[PDB]
Amino acid sequence: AVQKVVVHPLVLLSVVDHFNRIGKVGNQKRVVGVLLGSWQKKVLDVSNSFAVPFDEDDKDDSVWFLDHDYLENMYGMFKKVNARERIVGWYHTGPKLHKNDIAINELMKRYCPNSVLVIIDVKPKDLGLPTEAYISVEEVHDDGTPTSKTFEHVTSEIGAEEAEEVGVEHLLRDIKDTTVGTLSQRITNQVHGLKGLNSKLLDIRSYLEKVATGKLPINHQIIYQLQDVFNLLPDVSLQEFVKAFYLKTNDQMVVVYLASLIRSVVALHNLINNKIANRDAEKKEG
Amino acid sequence: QAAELFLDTVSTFTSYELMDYKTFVTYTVYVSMIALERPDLREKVIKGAEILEVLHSLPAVRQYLFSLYECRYSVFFQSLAVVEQEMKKDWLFAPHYRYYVREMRIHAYSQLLESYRSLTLGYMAEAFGVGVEFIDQELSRFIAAGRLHCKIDKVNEIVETNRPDSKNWQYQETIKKGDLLLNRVQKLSRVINM
Amino acid sequence: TRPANHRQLTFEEIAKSAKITVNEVELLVMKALSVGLVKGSIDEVDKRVHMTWVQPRVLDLQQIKGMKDRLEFWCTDVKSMEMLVEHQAHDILT
Amino acid sequence: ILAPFDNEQSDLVHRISGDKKLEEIPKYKDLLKLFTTMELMRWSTLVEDYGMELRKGSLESPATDVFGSTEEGEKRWKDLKNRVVEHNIRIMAKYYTRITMKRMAQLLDLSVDESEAFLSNLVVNKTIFAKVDRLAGIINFQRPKDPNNLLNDWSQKLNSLMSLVNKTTHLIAKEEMIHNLQ
Amino acid sequence: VIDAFRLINANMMVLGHEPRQTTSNLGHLNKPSIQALIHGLNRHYYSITINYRKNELEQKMLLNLHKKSWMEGLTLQDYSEHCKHNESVVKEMLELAKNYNKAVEEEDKMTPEQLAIKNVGKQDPKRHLEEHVDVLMTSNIVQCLAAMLDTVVFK
């Protein structure tokens, strides 16, 4: 269907503004709006947005109010100043997706059947990206319904255009990593990867405890995939693996050796040049 | 390097430094015995008629080369002894005339051991030269040097062979040349800067 | 039944556990492989087989506790390695 | 069936199979169903269940062509023999790893010398890889292992594991969302 | 390049006055460009200084630009192309090393004043060499560290 989505930063700043802007008006926990973008092949590119008035009461899961014609004619207004953009989705800023949300989608799907849901977390505490992307599918299973209706995951990333990137780079005066290179190649990576993996395993355990007891609506598919995951882990101890690993590292070291040798001899030549350029010039002051 | 630069057997005039074109031919065949292996030997120094016609007038060198090619090891050694005796008193070969010899002999061994795998050493006596103890000590001192990869057992008088990969040898020379260059550069480092 | 290691097994053990003569087990395992419920390989001259993957099954609240345990004392290793590396290279980008 | 195996045949059989009218002749239906699937009966049952049906019905004229002419009939029978023995070799090399000489010779219903003489021209044509030993009667497939491959597949398994463990969490989250949100 | 302007009435110069009575240094910290001053500028309109209103929250969430997935940090870079890249680079190191000592021998036989010109037409071995050492070391270090971390963190 659709394979990945790329989000421009301008929508991030717009959403961050909108959240506080509504914070003025009322005690609303959440806000909602329309995402505009374009397509290339299986890839979606999203670039501009505007907010739409929305209301909900926690009285119950079935009492909420979204206004039609505001969106209807606002999209007309935007069309009349840039023809390239089409309505292509909607966003909200809840920390996790809510129970209403699928019934929300069935409203606005009329405007674009491919419509996708993007979550933008407004308050980061963590090293994952703030975005998420979800697309609706029916799924078949043995019993309980012919099909359920389910959100499923599409991969998302932030991108930038030629000139908005200049704009953002003007603003980030206050911090940068000292040097790109091997220290960035590590500290910007491995430690972050390990932290992410640890947090994933923590969430797995947190669910598994509330399945050993608690509410425990056991779902067998989880157990199936977990069986796969545990089966997949390799035996490192095998002799024929060890001999290969040594036969590779014992090769990789030679290149580091040679390169360090060359580096040393070049630095030596540089020292020789400096010293002879000094002893033949210092004498001129008598 | 000599054998590569001595492949000018069609452009060497009756020069003033080697009175004999035949002496030039003898020198080039002598060095080509060591430098190059069997395909090139069999392809260049035996298929080039310009030197075959000259060698036709030099029976000793002809039989010396043919003995090594045809695996007649019995006649090889007398010719080798004659050659090394002659080159001991010759100029620009004396300073290392022994070295040369100690190559050819070991080379002969490497020309026979790789065809078979469990050859008895008794066969050498009637095929390479009489004397069991002589061959025994020769093989022992050649194994100890790190060349001619094989092994010998005395209780049953047998000789086995092995096939080391072409990696360990490609490693020792690397490590030792690295050591010497590092030593030299350290000496350079301290000799400068007081 | 077997552990995840050590799951090589021999013809005669199948022949006993299926009470079929040895000479059929080859065609039995061929059948099993052909419908994709088990994945592996066979060695006829050793008379042994090396199974490597098997279809999942349903399992109960007693089995999952082992999952919980192995997950906990797996995660401890990740935590240890993180706490090691972020110390040993402290200076290179503090 | 007579054509040697190739991609063109392997997908042409797929295209021509599953035709609605073809069910009116279940015999040849079973023929191509047999040759589409895995390891197949050696030689006896096929000829015993199909060697006589090639004269009845109202469509046996190509069957008579396979039978009538002496040279044509003999050649086509020989070619069918070769096709089935080749299919057996292909599938066993797909599944087996190392096997004795006599076992597969028996599974080919013909002598050991004929077996090796028949697979020799196969291996020299670079279509099936095997290194048979004529001293202990042990033959194998199993191409030698290269260092780059071992740990490369190890890294591939790591990639799959990471992808799966990443995909689990979203499903877990949508599981909690429909029960403990209110 | 952003700027802000406002008009001024010519009445004030008819009186001989000038606009923008001044009490502070902080207006004069910048100079207009010649191109801006050829056009009207001070004889018709005057500029105002600008600054950028910020808050920490939007900064805290904007710097996520070009952050990447954790999994990307643990990939092993296709062990089959790695060696090909390595012993491709080594070849040009060979062909450069054989060209270094000529430029070492010519170090002093000519006037140094023109030595700069000796560079301009023709690449020099010394500077062009060491970037290969940089590449080789940067790659081969991390390729080796990642394998160890993997061979400990999984089973």
Tab-separated table of N, CA and C in Angstrom, chain C residues 12-89:
chain	number	residue	atom	x	y	z
C	12	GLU	N	16.888	-44.226	15.100
C	12	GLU	CA	16.295	-45.271	15.924
C	12	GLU	C	15.426	-44.689	17.028
C	13	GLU	N	15.750	-43.487	17.497
C	13	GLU	CA	14.933	-42.863	18.530
C	13	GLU	C	13.564	-42.481	17.983
C	14	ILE	N	13.511	-42.024	16.732
C	14	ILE	CA	12.224	-41.809	16.079
C	14	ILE	C	11.496	-43.134	15.905
C	15	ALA	N	12.198	-44.134	15.367
C	15	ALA	CA	11.581	-45.429	15.098
C	15	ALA	C	10.915	-45.994	16.343
C	16	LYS	N	11.572	-45.865	17.496
C	16	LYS	CA	10.934	-46.234	18.753
C	16	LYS	C	9.741	-45.335	19.050
C	17	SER	N	9.951	-44.017	19.022
C	17	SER	CA	8.913	-43.096	19.475
C	17	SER	C	7.732	-43.010	18.517
C	18	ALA	N	7.889	-43.452	17.273
C	18	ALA	CA	6.778	-43.555	16.337
C	18	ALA	C	6.337	-44.989	16.081
C	19	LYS	N	7.001	-45.968	16.694
C	19	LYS	CA	6.800	-47.401	16.447
C	19	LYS	C	6.573	-47.697	14.964
C	20	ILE	N	7.515	-47.225	14.150
C	20	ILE	CA	7.618	-47.577	12.741
C	20	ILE	C	9.045	-48.039	12.482
C	21	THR	N	9.201	-48.969	11.542
C	21	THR	CA	10.527	-49.488	11.238
C	21	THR	C	11.429	-48.379	10.712
C	22	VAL	N	12.733	-48.557	10.937
C	22	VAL	CA	13.731	-47.547	10.581
C	22	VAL	C	13.565	-47.089	9.137
C	23	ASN	N	13.402	-48.042	8.221
C	23	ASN	CA	13.460	-47.767	6.791
C	23	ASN	C	12.404	-46.779	6.303
C	24	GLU	N	11.410	-46.430	7.121
C	24	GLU	CA	10.377	-45.490	6.702
C	24	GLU	C	10.646	-44.058	7.142
C	25	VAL	N	11.502	-43.866	8.146
C	25	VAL	CA	11.598	-42.564	8.790
C	25	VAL	C	12.082	-41.516	7.802
C	26	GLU	N	12.892	-41.919	6.821
C	26	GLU	CA	13.331	-40.977	5.799
C	26	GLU	C	12.143	-40.397	5.047
C	27	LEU	N	11.219	-41.256	4.620
C	27	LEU	CA	10.075	-40.758	3.873
C	27	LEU	C	9.145	-39.971	4.777
C	28	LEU	N	9.106	-40.330	6.060
C	28	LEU	CA	8.291	-39.573	7.003
C	28	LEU	C	8.819	-38.153	7.164
C	29	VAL	N	10.125	-38.010	7.385
C	29	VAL	CA	10.682	-36.680	7.605
C	29	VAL	C	10.645	-35.867	6.318
C	30	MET	N	10.862	-36.512	5.167
C	30	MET	CA	10.674	-35.828	3.892
C	30	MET	C	9.275	-35.235	3.804
C	31	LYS	N	8.260	-36.041	4.126
C	31	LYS	CA	6.891	-35.538	4.142
C	31	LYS	C	6.754	-34.348	5.079
C	32	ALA	N	7.269	-34.481	6.301
C	32	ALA	CA	7.159	-33.402	7.279
C	32	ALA	C	7.760	-32.109	6.749
C	33	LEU	N	8.948	-32.198	6.150
C	33	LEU	CA	9.594	-31.015	5.592
C	33	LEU	C	8.774	-30.422	4.458
C	34	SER	N	8.225	-31.277	3.593
C	34	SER	CA	7.572	-30.796	2.382
C	34	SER	C	6.341	-29.948	2.668
C	35	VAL	N	5.703	-30.124	3.823
C	35	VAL	CA	4.560	-29.304	4.202
C	35	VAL	C	4.949	-28.200	5.178
C	36	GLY	N	6.240	-28.014	5.423
C	36	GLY	CA	6.710	-26.799	6.050
C	36	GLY	C	6.463	-26.674	7.534
C	37	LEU	N	6.021	-27.734	8.207
C	37	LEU	CA	5.803	-27.635	9.644
C	37	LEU	C	7.091	-27.764	10.446
C	38	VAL	N	8.159	-28.276	9.841
C	38	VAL	CA	9.454	-28.354	10.501
C	38	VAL	C	10.529	-28.129	9.449
C	39	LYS	N	11.652	-27.558	9.876
C	39	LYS	CA	12.717	-27.135	8.978
C	39	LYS	C	14.046	-27.621	9.529
C	40	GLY	N	14.899	-28.138	8.654
C	40	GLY	CA	16.120	-28.769	9.130
C	40	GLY	C	16.859	-29.471	8.016
C	41	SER	N	17.575	-30.525	8.391
C	41	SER	CA	18.335	-31.282	7.404
C	41	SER	C	18.636	-32.671	7.949
C	42	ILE	N	19.074	-33.545	7.048
C	42	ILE	CA	19.226	-34.968	7.322
C	42	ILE	C	20.626	-35.423	6.936
C	43	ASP	N	21.112	-36.461	7.618
C	43	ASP	CA	22.409	-37.077	7.350
C	43	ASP	C	22.181	-38.585	7.362
C	44	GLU	N	22.127	-39.183	6.169
C	44	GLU	CA	21.782	-40.594	6.041
C	44	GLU	C	22.918	-41.526	6.442
C	45	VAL	N	24.173	-41.100	6.307
C	45	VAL	CA	25.258	-42.034	6.585
C	45	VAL	C	25.570	-42.058	8.072
C	46	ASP	N	25.279	-40.971	8.780
C	46	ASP	CA	25.300	-40.982	10.233
C	46	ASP	C	23.988	-41.469	10.831
C	47	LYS	N	22.917	-41.488	10.038
C	47	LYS	CA	21.570	-41.807	10.511
C	47	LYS	C	21.130	-40.814	11.580
C	48	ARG	N	21.257	-39.525	11.267
C	48	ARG	CA	20.930	-38.477	12.220
C	48	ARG	C	20.213	-37.352	11.491
C	49	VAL	N	19.521	-36.513	12.254
C	49	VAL	CA	18.842	-35.355	11.698
C	49	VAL	C	19.080	-34.152	12.597
C	50	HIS	N	19.041	-32.972	11.977
C	50	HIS	CA	19.332	-31.686	12.607
C	50	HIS	C	18.128	-30.792	12.336
C	51	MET	N	17.126	-30.871	13.200
C	51	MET	CA	16.007	-29.946	13.147
C	51	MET	C	16.423	-28.590	13.699
C	52	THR	N	15.843	-27.524	13.144
C	52	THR	CA	16.252	-26.166	13.473
C	52	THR	C	15.104	-25.208	13.738
C	53	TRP	N	13.900	-25.470	13.238
C	53	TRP	CA	12.760	-24.630	13.566
C	53	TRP	C	11.500	-25.480	13.569
C	54	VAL	N	10.527	-25.080	14.388
C	54	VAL	CA	9.281	-25.823	14.537
C	54	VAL	C	8.121	-24.854	14.733
C	55	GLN	N	6.968	-25.233	14.195
C	55	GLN	CA	5.765	-24.419	14.281
C	55	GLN	C	5.453	-24.073	15.736
C	56	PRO	N	5.099	-22.824	16.032
C	56	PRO	CA	4.679	-22.465	17.390
C	56	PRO	C	3.452	-23.247	17.835
C	57	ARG	N	3.199	-23.222	19.143
C	57	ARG	CA	2.005	-23.834	19.713
C	57	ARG	C	1.471	-22.946	20.827
C	58	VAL	N	0.234	-23.212	21.248
C	58	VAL	CA	-0.309	-22.550	22.429
C	58	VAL	C	0.337	-23.111	23.687
C	59	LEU	N	0.536	-22.247	24.678
C	59	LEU	CA	1.150	-22.648	25.934
C	59	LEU	C	0.612	-21.759	27.044
C	60	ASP	N	0.688	-22.262	28.274
C	60	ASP	CA	-0.142	-21.798	29.377
C	60	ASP	C	0.655	-20.950	30.366
C	61	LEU	N	-0.045	-20.495	31.409
C	61	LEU	CA	0.510	-19.580	32.403
C	61	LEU	C	1.677	-20.158	33.187
C	62	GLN	N	1.919	-21.461	33.121
C	62	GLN	CA	3.094	-22.000	33.790
C	62	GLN	C	4.337	-21.918	32.918
C	63	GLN	N	4.180	-22.100	31.608
C	63	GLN	CA	5.326	-22.041	30.708
C	63	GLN	C	5.857	-20.619	30.550
C	64	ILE	N	4.969	-19.623	30.484
C	64	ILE	CA	5.404	-18.248	30.242
C	64	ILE	C	6.323	-17.723	31.339
C	65	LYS	N	6.253	-18.292	32.541
C	65	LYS	CA	7.143	-17.853	33.606
C	65	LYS	C	8.605	-18.057	33.224
C	66	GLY	N	8.904	-19.144	32.512
C	66	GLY	CA	10.259	-19.332	32.019
C	66	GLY	C	10.665	-18.261	31.026
C	67	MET	N	9.712	-17.806	30.210
C	67	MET	CA	9.974	-16.687	29.314
C	67	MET	C	10.333	-15.448	30.114
C	68	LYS	N	9.518	-15.141	31.121
C	68	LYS	CA	9.775	-14.002	31.995
C	68	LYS	C	11.178	-14.061	32.592
C	69	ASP	N	11.553	-15.223	33.122
C	69	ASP	CA	12.859	-15.362	33.759
C	69	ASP	C	13.991	-15.166	32.759
C	70	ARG	N	13.921	-15.861	31.617
C	70	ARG	CA	15.010	-15.765	30.655
C	70	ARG	C	15.104	-14.365	30.079
C	71	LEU	N	13.984	-13.649	30.025
C	71	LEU	CA	14.019	-12.276	29.546
C	71	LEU	C	14.682	-11.365	30.569
C	72	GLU	N	14.351	-11.530	31.849
C	72	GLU	CA	14.996	-10.728	32.883
C	72	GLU	C	16.511	-10.919	32.878
C	73	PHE	N	16.965	-12.170	32.988
C	73	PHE	CA	18.413	-12.348	33.026
C	73	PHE	C	19.043	-12.364	31.639
C	74	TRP	N	18.288	-11.994	30.607
C	74	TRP	CA	18.898	-11.474	29.393
C	74	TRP	C	19.113	-9.968	29.499
C	75	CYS	N	18.073	-9.234	29.899
C	75	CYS	CA	18.141	-7.776	29.942
C	75	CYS	C	19.253	-7.280	30.858
C	76	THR	N	19.552	-8.038	31.916
C	76	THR	CA	20.644	-7.626	32.796
C	76	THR	C	21.964	-7.464	32.040
C	77	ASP	N	22.196	-8.271	30.999
C	77	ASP	CA	23.452	-8.174	30.259
C	77	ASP	C	23.519	-6.893	29.441
C	78	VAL	N	22.404	-6.504	28.826
C	78	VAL	CA	22.357	-5.231	28.117
C	78	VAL	C	22.678	-4.091	29.069
C	79	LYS	N	22.047	-4.101	30.246
C	79	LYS	CA	22.299	-3.021	31.197
C	79	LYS	C	23.770	-2.969	31.592
C	80	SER	N	24.373	-4.137	31.830
C	80	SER	CA	25.784	-4.178	32.201
C	80	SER	C	26.673	-3.616	31.100
C	81	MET	N	26.416	-3.997	29.850
C	81	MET	CA	27.279	-3.534	28.768
C	81	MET	C	27.148	-2.034	28.554
C	82	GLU	N	25.929	-1.503	28.648
C	82	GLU	CA	25.757	-0.056	28.547
C	82	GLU	C	26.546	0.667	29.634
C	83	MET	N	26.378	0.233	30.890
C	83	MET	CA	27.088	0.888	31.986
C	83	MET	C	28.597	0.754	31.843
C	84	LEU	N	29.069	-0.294	31.164
C	84	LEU	CA	30.502	-0.422	30.923
C	84	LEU	C	30.972	0.579	29.878
C	85	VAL	N	30.358	0.544	28.695
C	85	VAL	CA	30.874	1.335	27.583
C	85	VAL	C	30.774	2.821	27.886
C	86	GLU	N	29.659	3.264	28.473
C	86	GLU	CA	29.543	4.701	28.706
C	86	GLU	C	30.550	5.215	29.725
C	87	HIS	N	31.221	4.323	30.451
C	87	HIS	CA	32.330	4.682	31.324
C	87	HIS	C	33.678	4.599	30.620
C	88	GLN	N	33.949	3.483	29.940
C	88	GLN	CA	35.289	3.247	29.414
C	88	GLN	C	35.689	4.237	28.326
C	89	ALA	N	34.729	4.868	27.657
C	89	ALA	CA	35.013	5.882	26.649
C	89	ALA	C	34.479	7.240	27.080
